[PDB]
Amino acid sequence: LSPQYNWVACGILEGGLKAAGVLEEGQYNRELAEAIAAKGEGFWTTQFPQIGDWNEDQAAALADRAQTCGLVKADT
Ligand SMILES: C[As](C)(=O)[O-]
Ligand SMILES: C[As](C)(=O)[O-]
Ligand SMILES: [Zn+2]
Ligand SMILES: [Zn+2]
Ligand SMILES: [Zn+2]
Ligand SMILES: [Zn+2]
Q1: 31 assigned binding-site residue
Q2: Which CATH number does the domain housing residue 47 bear?
Q3: For 1, which of 45, 47, 65, 76 is 20 to 30 Å away at the CA?
Q4: C-alpha distances in Å from residue 19, one per residue of 39, 42, 44
Q5: Cβ(25) – ligand 2 distance below 6 Å
Q6: Which domain range does residue 34 map to?
Q7: Which ligand does the CA of 23 lie closest to?
Q8: What are the helix and strand counts (H, E) for the chain?
Q9: What's the domain count of the chain?
């Protein structure tokens, strides 16, 4: 219930995700994570495995925040 996952924050989130253009209709947690990671990888990820990982890690976790907001469906 608390100001962790309300509609405002989730709105800011949903906004931000459509902004960077990775959100989609009927989308699954995993599909988004992979899209966020795509737009995340550049020099630093492609040149450093450890940052390449950090990317996938945060990309994955961000989709989790996104799932709790009802923005994406759980993987099936
Ligand atoms: C209201 As909509 C464009 O996030 O399906
Ligand atoms: C529930 As939606 C992110 O398709 O408007
Ligand atoms: Zn929709
Ligand atoms: Zn990791
Ligand atoms: Zn997950
Ligand atoms: Zn929406």
Answers
A1: no
A2: 1.10.10.1280
A3: 76
A4: 12, 19, 22
A5: yes
A6: 1-76
A7: 2
A8: 4, 0
A9: 1
